[PDB]
Design a protein around this ligand. Structure first.
Ligand code: NAP
Ligand code: NAP
Ligand code: NAP
Ligand code: 3KH
Ligand code: 3KH
Ligand code: 3KH
Lengths: 249, 240, 250, 250
């Protein structure tokens, strides 16, 4: 009776806030993770303490390879095994690091940045759709996709590809009652590795409050798109960026 | 106590559905009208029956003229007079009709399709901002702005200007805590069109439009500014 | 036999560069101006010395009013009166100044100038150009920064957005008549005359490609391309000529 | 000293027209091909007949694999070995076929081909071109219909969106080296040879400007503009050459 959702990269940060908020809304959740096993299991525990049998973890590397399609099939399969249905897919997992044009090989960087950000979402969408009410998919896009960070070409290419996926899947899956939309953060939870001075630099550019989005503010937008209040919305990407993308150089 | 909202063109169709849903969310509402007095009063009567003195009407012609600034000032003033505050402005009033390039005087068409659709929103935004917690403005945009209807140049120009207003005002009013966003309908703005809509199994409704407005004004959108949410069932994604 | 073009606001700066380059390409030109009469006649003189009877001036206020349609009709009529044809229209004239939302022109004067020159006059000129009708085209001078606007420039930004709308709508509607409609969108080109060098340099340093503004000739080069036979399948396109400026985040 | 250009997928159709036009403009050219050896060689021979020693061919599969980076480096290197320089890179090669989301080549083969040719190979060639480095520029062949995609072409559409991102990212990053990066976005150009005329006509009828597809030469014309001295302030721009097709509602 309770709908179920898959959230990729849900152990920490934005994915975690999305998983929590979906769960609070009445969803049973698959918490996908890659490396963060301790945090993933700890979240599922917390959620199950609240309503028993409403959260499972599922481990998978979302780097592109010849076995990525089986890994994505497995993620969707894990939701059906635990819950007997899969109503919502949130493509939240992402690799993010510079790849300048001028210790990983370039084909590894391609496999990670294009695999996680675009190919895995595509295969997960395929598996989600094939395995099939208010069905929908939400992709975590990037509000700054047309004003990209310097030396982030592969990342930016993957995020552009994800816009294409959002539009193409919205068109193709509409006759099956599956809506596909995006949420596009500007600056939200900044990278762990980033110094406080660089963090503050980005914070000062944001027109609305000179602060980053909380993870919860991003999840709020995801909640809207999966809700019955968004039933005529497909192929839309909602910026949740405090106006950052509007600010000229 | 309760927040207050101005909705332009609120007597019928989309503006009515927006006024109703804001009222249901707990807003006091100014129902603006130009020609539809009976409809505006009927809505106000319906809302006041639910909760006393929570709905007023306000007449103004939104055509561009030397008196448009005064009229827009009055609309915002009427909210402050009735309710002591003005938290939300919904720029919903719209004129819609073709203006072929190869052939009402043209300058009258300009006054309506640019005046009502873009200049009135600009003047209302100025007045709203001047007279100033979760403050926001929502502009009713058009999902088909980049694939426009044939021979609707002035209309299309006004809706493009309204996008520009949404972004410019989002930037300039952010320091004041005023968020500025848009909702862009499709076919809600006949059977031939519905069959082209990807989510065509669902009928388009004014309430679906209002649902997106309600989100953008809510605390669930407090970091969202300068965004335009398409509510078009995927229509804008469909090639010719 | 030579084709003819109207350039609005052509007395100086980018409009002059466009009129000159069209003239060098073999066009006869209507140099429209509003206040810059000396500069306009002087440019017509230069072009007419190069080839006689190839340039005329035409004075018009492009502020919106109930007579703006007549003024726009007259500009197009001037081209047919001088040259017997009108092949190209370049909507280059523009008012540009701030209009803050929170507070000695009246607001309705600001609307009439910023929306009139930037959008309504281009619409009326387009109407008159089309109705008076080979390689026919219209080029609108747009703004590469239309989605990352200057703070407190709402009316200017609304006008330039409206011009993108006109470009697309007119391309759609006029295509059956063989009239192409395209746009050229500068980022920073010739900085305002009233701007001091220090402020100019702040803008210059933002530009990835060479940390300098576009020359007027660089803008004109893109106009020349769009009116040329090398752009015969291009309509409804807006070419940024911005040195990468619009790609730079805050 | 004549400048040099690499054109990928240059044996036929659009890439061929681009190679021809660049050669006519005075470029020496590397004609890259995958399967079309006879056509590539016939083009090189025709070009060398016009001016000896101005065209070479270079075979490479541009499908993504662990050897793709080496292949792309070899394509750029072949330009330097043949001509001593490489001024222009045109990323034209493309795979195009449907990949339905709901139910041959395996899906990972489809990924390697559609994403490899359309996006990753352009990225690797851009890296190699830049690492090797006056009017240097790259032109990527994009798709004017990228936001109104064909039904069931998700991977193709993803690859073309990725290419827009590459165009913008590389424009920003390479601007300090004086390398401009732009795109040309056809709508309907040369249709498949086997596609029935009745099917070709369904697409032709949708084009506002002339109810016809672009010739390969019309696409090449925009490429020539972008690499020319007339575009030296243009970077990060994508020119639609689509006859207004992308402006047409459903
Ligand atoms: N934060 C921002 O400011 C911002 C801005 C724009 C867009 N976004 C987008 O919003 C989403 C969430 O942002 P975020 O900052 O929360 O993301 P994040 O913490 O950088 O990454 C989210 C998760 O992705 C997973 N991941 C990384 N590489 C992976 C791989 N090869 N296979 C499988 N999973 C992998 C990680 O899982 P494990 O920890 O389990 O290994 C990680 O916890 C992302 O899609 C991001 O691109 C965020
Ligand atoms: N320069 C830049 O950096 C830049 C950046 C983005 C976009 N653009 C666009 O490119 C185009 C040319 O730029 P620019 O700097 O050369 O323009 P500009 O010098 O600011 O203005 C060009 C001409 O517009 C005419 N004009 C102004 N108000 C008018 C009115 N009410 N009626 C009739 N004509 C009027 C003036 O003619 P008179 O002198 O005869 O009175 C003026 O010479 C404009 O459309 C502009 O918006 C320029
Ligand atoms: N034609 C149109 O209407 C249209 C519309 C939108 C966009 N475009 C874009 O414009 C560009 C040119 O269009 P087109 O129709 O002329 O292209 P096309 O003929 O479909 O393909 C161009 C060449 O790409 C090469 N190619 C394909 N797969 C390859 C692989 N795995 N490795 C290496 N090379 C490969 C082929 O080379 P070989 O023959 O040597 O094997 C082919 O001749 C393309 O990027 C296309 O996407 C075209
Ligand atoms: N401007 C930005 N600074 N950090 C960003 C960021 C941080 C974490 C991310 N995870 N995925 N993508 C991310 C972008 S975007
Ligand atoms: N960023 C910019 N700095 N100056 C700009 C400018 C200069 C002259 C203009 N005339 N019309 N519009 C203009 C914008 S845009
Ligand atoms: N609408 C379109 N019809 N055919 C198209 C087409 C034809 C050949 C291509 N090669 N790459 N991409 C292509 C698109 S696009």
């Amino acid at each position: 009776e309770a709908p179920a959702a898959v959230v990729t990269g849900a152990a920490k940060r934005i994915g975690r806030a999305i998983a929590v908020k979906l769960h609070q809304t009445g969803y049973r959740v698959v918490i996908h993770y890659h490396n963060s096993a301790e945090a993933a299991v700890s979240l599922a525990d917390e959620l199950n303490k609240e309503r028993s049998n409403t959260a499972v973890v599922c481990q998978a590397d979302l780097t592109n390879s010849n076995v990525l399609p089986a890994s994505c099939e497995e993620i969707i399969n894990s939701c059906f095994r635990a819950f007997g249905r899969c109503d919502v897919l949130v493509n939240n997992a992402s690799a993010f690091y510079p790849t300048p044009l001028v210790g990983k090989t370039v084909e590894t960087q391609v496999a990670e940045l294009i695999g996680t950000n675009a190919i895995a979402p595509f295969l997960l969408t395929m598996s989600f759709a094939q395995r099939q009410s208010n069905l929908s998919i939400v992709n975590l896009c990037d509000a700054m996709v047309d004003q990209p960070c310097m030396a982030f070409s592969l990342y930016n290419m993957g995020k552009h590809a994800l816009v294409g996926l959002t539009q193409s899947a919205a068109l193709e899956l509409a006759p099956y009652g599956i809506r596909v939309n995006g949420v596009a953060p500007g600056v939200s939870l900044l990278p762990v590795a980033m110094g406080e001075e660089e963090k503050d630099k980005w914070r000062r550019k944001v027109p609305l409050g000179r602060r980053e989005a909380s993870a919860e503010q991003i999840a709020d937008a995801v909640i809207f798109l999966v809700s019955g209040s968004a039933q005529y919305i497909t192929g839309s990407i909602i910026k949740v960026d405090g106006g950052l993308s509007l600010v000229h150089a």
